[PDB]
Curated annotation (Swiss-Prot), chains A, B:
Tissue specificity remark: Expressed in roots, coleoptiles, leaves, stems, tassels and ears.
Subcellular location: Endoplasmic reticulum lumen
UniProt main location, coarse: endoplasmic reticulum
Name of the protein in question: Auxin-binding protein 1
Keywords: Auxin signaling pathway, Disulfide bond, Endoplasmic reticulum, Glycoprotein, Metal-binding, Receptor, Signal, Zinc
Disulfide bonds: C2-C155
Residue positions the entry lists as glycosylated: N95
From-to range in the entire protein, with total length: 39 to 198 of 201
Single GO molecular function: zinc ion binding
Function: Receptor for the plant hormone auxin.
Lineage, opening ranks: Eukaryota, Viridiplantae, Streptophyta, Embryophyta, Tracheophyta
Length: 160, 160
């Protein structure tokens, strides 16, 4: 569904959450472009189950994560050579933050075997324009744009 | 002193908090322009003590709040009158979100007597350009710009 709501105070617990077909994910856009009218920043609340990973991807915007619960590993590559290259792998834990430089290819993995990972994610220039890589050797020109992304599809179609 | 941190993954409990001379405030810039190099978004973590309030102010950027703990009241003024005017009082509670229209005058109040209010705040176009009002009756044209703001003064002076 597309749930639009521009009032000023909104209850996060009442904004319908979904995996959008991504196994192990639970997503809520807390404040965003297509659902609420934002123009410069957008905020997501996401929970990833044990062992799950996001796809390898990039987006031409700033992006900041804050870890509410759980632990994991951040994988990041470079945006300057013709492909991402073998990534940096950096562990993170509850109450850590990390920002992804514009266009850097990255992946977030919930490497804990038992607890869910819950983060707040903030982006600039919404909505997100995510290009997907199938592995760290795929060249940057070859990444596939998936726009709108699955949590924006219903509202993107409703706004034409 | 100015604390600059060029690290990718940071522990938020080790970024130094301060009131910056604002009674009942505790602030940490989680990811920002002067402290970490951000250009498009900046993220703060703020705790306000029971009864305390931010000054009445406005800023030419988007601003989104997410309430992590506690509860309170958002006070919103007019951007169409020549002054903010008597404010609308909008209650908010744990797990709510609110976005402040660009340039609207507002104040956040911890109207709870029992527990601290903690919020994650996101702004666009950092660092903040905050104009202060002495009361809801002050004309928009008389509001005073305080730049750099108190949590940016040390790095702004160090930058020279
Ligand atoms: C991730 O890590 C984060 C960082 O560690 C965590 O957030 C922090 O959580 C702390 C633990 O709960 C939390 O500590 C509480 O701070 C509040 C809020 O504080 C201020 O006001 C206090 C109370 O005030 C009044 O009385 C005073 C005398 O009693 C008067 O002086 C005053 O004017 C007023 O009327 C003040 O005592 C306090 O003041 C000072 O403290 C500053 C340091 O904060 C100094 O700069 C200053 O000189 C002086 O020492 C504050 O201004 C308290 O009310 C409460 O009892 C705890 O101290 C802290 O605030 C949180 N930080 C932020 C930025 O939010 C977070 O929880 C972690 N999250 C996860 C998921 O793990
Ligand atoms: C502020 O409000 C927030 C919103 O209410 C709240 O955050 C919510 O908190 C709840 C409670 O803790 C969380 O619920 C937890 O969700 C996790 C993770 O869920 C996802 O993964 C599970 C497990 O997946 C895998 O295992 C299954 C087998 O069981 C496989 O099929 C699968 O492939 C994987 O291997 C999965 O079952 C979930 O899927 C279902 O649910 C989604 C909806 O989320 C449907 O769309 C889907 O079709 C299906 O029914 C999902 O993919 C779960 O494991 C836990 O058991 C528990 O349910 C929410 O995740 C969380 N929401 C967000 C967005 O983070 C805040 O906590 C609250 N905060 C405060 C301060 O109060
Ligand atoms: O922008 C990010 O890194 C978040 C993110 C981007 C793309 C796909 C995702 C799937 C599941 C969870 C998060 C995801
Ligand atoms: O509404 C805001 O921009 C945050 C904010 C702006 C100005 C002063 C403040 C004092 C204490 C806590 C937050 C404050
Ligand atoms: Zn990303
Ligand atoms: Zn403000």
């Amino acid at each position: 569904s597309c749930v639009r709501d521009n009032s000023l105070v909104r209850d996060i617990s009442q904004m319908p959450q979904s995996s959008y077909g991504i196994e192990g994910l639970s997503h809520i856009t807390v404040a965003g472009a297509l659902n609420h009218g934002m123009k410069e920043v957008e905020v997501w609340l996401q929970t990833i189950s044990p062992g799950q990973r996001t796809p390898i991807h990039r987006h031409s915007c700033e992006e900041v994560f804050t870890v509410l619960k759980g632990k994991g590993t951040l994988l990041m590559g470079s945006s300057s050579l013709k492909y991402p290259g073998q990534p940096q792998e950096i562990p993170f834990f509850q109450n850590t933050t990390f920002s992804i430089p514009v266009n850097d290819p990255h992946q977030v993995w919930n490497s804990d075997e038992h607890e869910d990972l819950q983060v707040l994610v903030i982006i600039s220039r919404p909505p997100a324009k995510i290009f997907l890589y199938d592995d760290w050797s795929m060249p940057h020109t070859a990444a596939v744009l998936k726009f709108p992304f699955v949590w924006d599809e219903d509202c993107f179609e409703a706004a034409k």
